Every structure is written in structure tokens, then in C-alpha cells.
Amino acid sequence: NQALLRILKETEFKKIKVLGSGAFGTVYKGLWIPEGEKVKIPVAIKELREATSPKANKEILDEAYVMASVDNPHVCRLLGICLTSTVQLIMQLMPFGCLLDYVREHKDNIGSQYLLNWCVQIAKGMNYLEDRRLVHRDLAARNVLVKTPQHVKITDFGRAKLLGAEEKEYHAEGGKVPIKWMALESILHRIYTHQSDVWSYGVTVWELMTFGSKPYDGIPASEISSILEKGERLPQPPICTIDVYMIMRKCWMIDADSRPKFRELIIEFSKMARDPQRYLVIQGDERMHLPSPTDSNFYR
Numbered sequence: 001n002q003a004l005l006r007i008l009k010e011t012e013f014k015k016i017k018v019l020g021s022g023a024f025g026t027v028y029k030g031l032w033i034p035e036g037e038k039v040k041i042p043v044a045i046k047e048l049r050e051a052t053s054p055k056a057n058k059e060i061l062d063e064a065y066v067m068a069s070v071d072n073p074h075v076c077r078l079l080g081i082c083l084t085s086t087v088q089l090i091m092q093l094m095p096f097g098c099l100l101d102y103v104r105e106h107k108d109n110i111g112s113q114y115l116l117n118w119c120v121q122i123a124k125g126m127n128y129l130e131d132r133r134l135v136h137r138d139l140a141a142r143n144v145l146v147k148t149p150q151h152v153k154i155t156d157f158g159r160a161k162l163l164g165a166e167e168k169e170y171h172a173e174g175g176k177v178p179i180k181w182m183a184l185e186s187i188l189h190r191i192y193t194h195q196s197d198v199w200s201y202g203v204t205v206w207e208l209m210t211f212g213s214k215p216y217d218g219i220p221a222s223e224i225s226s227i228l229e230k231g232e233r234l235p236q237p238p239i240c241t242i243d244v245y246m247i248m249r250k251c252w253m254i255d256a257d258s259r260p261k262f263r264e265l266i267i268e269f270s271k272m273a274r275d276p277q278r279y280l281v282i283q284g285d286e287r288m289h290l291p292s293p294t295d296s297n298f299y300r
């Protein structure tokens with residue numbers, strides 16, 4: 001019913017194989033077998049790297065209950081936690097991996113309906129995060145995951161932050177940052193807001209519309225703030241109508257409050273997704289096919 005954090009013992013799940021890793025720790029494909037329940041659930045298990053200053057179990061559980069309460073069709077949900085020598089987060093498994101790799105691998109068969117639907121879904125997920133006062137701070141096609149070709153979910157690997165009721169900004173510290181996805185105010189001042197997430201949403205859409213091209217390819221990250229200040233932006237993808245490109249450009253306004261709100265992006269992309277071939281022009285669009293549960297019915 002309501003999303004609630006489950007506490008798991010080590011007896012109730014198994015890490016099967018590594019899917020990937022990073023500064024955050026390691027993600028495994030796994031199986032969750034809840035005690036007494038006689039069910040087997042495929043999951044992703046994130047075992048977090050040991051910190052110099054590990055949080056107390058009470059601190060971790062408090063954060064986890066908030067994380068588990070994040071319940072939207074387009075955000076990957078925390079299902080449970082196991083606290084031992086390490087922190088293990090049991091997440092929904094997204095069978096098809098990240099959307100960036102998916103669009104690169106399948107670009108010859110991705111049509112306008114899918115692209116625009118994905119844009120709607122990501123906007124809905126981000127709008128939900130904003131309602132929950134969560135700033136994501138790392139939105140990119142690599143951090144949207146694929147449940148089915150028809151259904152994607154935003155994920156978080158540790159950068160997301162909860163704002164207080166009266167806080168409108170998160171002020172970050174030093175470290176590696178995803179420069180080519182970031183708003184200017186984040187690059188120059190380490191300021192993050194829901195409106196800087198909107199900038200990143202625009203870059204994410206650009207990634208999808210170019211079927212996974214690298215933004216500002218070949219350009220040093222150190223030079224990005226300079227080119228942005230000159231007014232340069234990512235170019236119109238060849239498949240995009242002016243209407244689509246203009247929404248993307250609005251996401252990259254210098255004035256954060258001149259950028260669209262996610263609630264507005266939901267409305268605009270929903271309109272476009274209702275008539276996809278009006279808004280994106282893809283050769284052979286009507287012929288393209290991705291795996292669907294209705295294939296057997298239409299002999300595909």
C-alpha cells in the first residue's frame with residue numbers, strides 16, 4: 001500500500017553477480033526471499049563503500065525511511081535495507097540497464113513515441129522529487145534506468161539531497177561533479193536547486209534525441225562555463241522540430257527562474273507525446289519496433 005522500508009537480515013537475500021561499481025560502492029544483481037513469505041524477488045543490491053566516518057545505525061535508518069517513502073512510477077524505489085558491517089540497500093532491479101546505453105544499442109529501432117514518452121516519464125519523476133523537496137543533482141541519461149522499453153525510472157547513487165522546509169538551495173562542497181550536465185550556478189558556485197535539475201533535464205533530453213551522443217563532445221570540462229557564458233548551447237538535434245528544441249533551450253537559460261518548471265515540462269511533453277510524429281521527424285519512424293507484450297498478438 002504505502003511504501004514502507006523493510007529491514008532485511010542477511011538470511012533473506014543473496015548477491016548473485018556484480019552489475020557495476022563506483023565511488024559509492026558496488027551494485028549487484030540479487031534475489032530477495034523474505035522470511036516466511038515463499039516468494040523470490042529479483043533485486044539490485046547496493047553495498048555502500050566504507051566511509052571514514054560511518055553514520056550510526058540510527059542515522060542510517062532515519063535516512064532510509066525517508067528514501068523508502070519515495071514512491072513514484074518513475075523513480076527507482078528502495079525496497080529494504082540490511083545493516084551489518086556494511087550498509088546494503090535493496091532496490092528494484094531494472095532489467096534493461098541504463099537508458100543511455102539502451103538508446104545507443106537500439107537507436108535504429110527507437111521512434112518518436114518512445115522518445116517523447118520517456119521525456120514525459122522523466123519529467124513526472126522529477127516533479128515528484130521536487131514535491132518531496134529532493135534535489136537530484138545528477139540527472140543524466142546514464143542515471144535513468146529501464147524497467148521495460150516502455151517504462152523508465154530515475155535512480156540516485158548518493159548525490160541527491162533533501163531540502164529543509166524553508167531551504168530553496170543546497171550548497172555543495174568540493175569534489176568531482178558532472179560538469180557537462182550542470183547549470184552555470186552549480187558550476188561556478190556549487191549551488192543546486194530544483195531549477196538546476198531542470199537544466200540537467202534539458203541535457204538529458206538532448207542525449208535521448210541524439211540517441212546517446214556525448215554533450216559538448218571533445219570539449220574540456222574546464223572550458224564549459226566559459227562557453228556557456230558566451231551564450232553557446234547544445235545544438236538542435238536533427239530529429240527535433242523547433243518546438244522541441246525551444247523547450248530544451250529554455251532549460252538552459254542563465255536565469256534559473258526563467259527555466260521551465262517540471263510541472264510545465266510534463267504538460268508540454270505530454271501534448272507532444274500525444275502526436276509524436278508532429279514533433280520529432282525520424283526516417284522510417286512508423287516502421288520501427290521495440291519489444292512489446294503485444295508482439296504475439298500482431299505476429300511481430
Ligand SMILES: *CCC(=O)Nc1cccc(Oc2nc(Nc3cnn(C)c3)nc3[nH]ccc23)c1
Nearest residue numbers: 019020027044091092093094095097098100142
Ligand atoms: C549507463 C549507466 C550504467 O551502465 N549504469 C549502471 C550499471 C550497473 C548497475 C547499475 O545500477 C543498477 N542497475 C540495474 N540493472 C541493470 C541491468 N543491467 N545492468 C548493467 C544494470 N538496476 C538497478 N536498480 C537500482 C540500481 C540499479 C547502473
